[PDB]
Amino acid sequence: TVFRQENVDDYYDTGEELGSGQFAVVKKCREKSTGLQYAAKFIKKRRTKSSRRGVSREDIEREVSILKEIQHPNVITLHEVYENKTDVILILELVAGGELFDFLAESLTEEEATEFLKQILNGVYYLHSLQIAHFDLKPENIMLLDRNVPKPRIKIIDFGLAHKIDFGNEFKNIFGTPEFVAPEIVNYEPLGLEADMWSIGVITYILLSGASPFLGDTKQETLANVSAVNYEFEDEYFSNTSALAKDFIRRLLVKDPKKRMTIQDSLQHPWIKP
Ligand SMILES: Oc1cc(O)cc(/C=C/c2ccc(O)c(O)c2)c1
C-alpha cells in the first residue's frame, strides 16, 4: 500500500518534538488547512532488503493497517499517512498530557490506579474484540490527554508491534520490552491476546507499588525472571493494598496463557467490576 507522497511540509508545520525512539521521532504539528494540531511520527524506512536499520515496509504497513481499523476513545486515532524516500509519516491524534510513565514518576491509590486501569482495559477490550494484540503495552505507550486533571483520560499508542490474531496465535518472534513481555514472548512461543493481559498485570503491579515485578539487574535477568514468574508482592510496597488488587494481578501474571485472565475476565474481576 502506498501513502501520500506530497511533501508533508506543504500541509503541516511541525513544532515541539514529543519523543523519539530507535527508528522514529514524534513532532507536534499543525495542519495548515484546518489549524488542527496532531503528532507527526516519522518512521525511518529500511533502505535495503537485508538491512537492520529502519522499519521494514511489511512492519510499517501492518502498523498502519491496524491503526486505520481502530476508533475508540482509549486508542490513538490515525489522521493521515505520508511517506517519502526516507520516512513514513503517521499524522496521529495529538495527546498532550505526556506518558503515563512520566506521570507515574511524579505510587497511586487503588482508585487512581483503577481509574487508569479501567480505561486501559476498555481500550484493550476494544482491540482484543478486533483480534488485535498490541504486544507492547507498558506505561510509556499510554498517553494522557491532560495530566493536570484529577482523573486523566488515556490513549494507548505505539502499535509498532501490534498484530491481528485471526488464528488464535501468531508465531513470529515478536518481542517488546523485557519488563513487560509475557513468558510466551520470552520463550519464543506462539503468541496471542493473552500476552497483552500479562503486560496489564505488570502495569497494574507498577501502578500500585511504583516497583517493577520482574526487573533484574540486566535484561537477561529480567527475561529469566519473567519466564520463571519470579515476582512477589513486597509487603513494604503492598501492605496497604487490598487483597483483591493483588488477586487481580496474580490472575494475570500466570505463565500458562490458557489459565491467564482474558480481557473479559479482567473486566468482570471483583476489583474492577462496579
Ligand atoms: O508523544 C506522543 C504524542 C502523540 O499525540 C502521539 C504519540 C504517538 C502515537 C502513536 C500512535 C500509534 C502508533 O502506532 C504509534 O507508533 C505512535 C506520541
| Alpha carbon distances (Å) from 263 to 89, 135, 185, 251 | 31, 14, 18, 11
Q: What is the identity of the amino acid at 63?
A: E
Residue 133 CB less than 6 A away from ligand 1: no
Residue 223 forms beta bridges with which residues? none
CA quadruple 176, 179, 182, 185: dihedral sign: positive
Is 26:41 a contact under the CB 8 Å cutoff?
yes
User: In residues, how long is the chain?
Assistant: 274
User: In whole angstroms, what is the distance from residue 268 CA to residue 274 CA?
Assistant: 9
**Atom number in ligand 1 closest to CA 63:** 14
Atom of ligand 1 nearest to the CA of 157: 11
Catalytic residues: 136
Ligand 1, pocket-test mutation among 41, 79, 138, most atoms within 8 A of CB: 41
- What was the elucidation method? X-ray
Residue nearest atom 1 in ligand 1 by C-alpha distance: 18
Q: Which atom of ligand 1 is nearest to the CA of 18?
A: 1
Cβ 190 under 6 angstroms from ligand 1: no
3-state secondary structure 149-203: CCCCCEEECCCCCCEECCCCCECCCCCCCCCCCCHHHHCCCCECCHHHHHHHHHH
Give the DSSP H/E element, type plus range, for residue 119: helix 110-129
First to last CA, the chain: 44
- Beta carbons within 8 Å of 183's beta carbon, 6+ residues apart: 189, 198, 226, 227, 229, 255
The three three-digit cell numbers of residue 154, written as one number: 488515556
Alpha-carbon gap, residue 53 to 46, rounded angstroms: 6
Indicate the pairing of strand 154-156 with strand 132-133: unpaired
For residue 205, give the nearest of 236, 248, 175 by alpha carbon: 248
Compute and round to an integer the Cα radius of gyration of the chain.
19
67 lines ligand 1 (CB under 6 A): yes
- The enclosing H or E element of 255 equals none
Resolution in A: 1.8
Is 93 close to ligand 1, i.e. is its CB under 6 Å away? yes
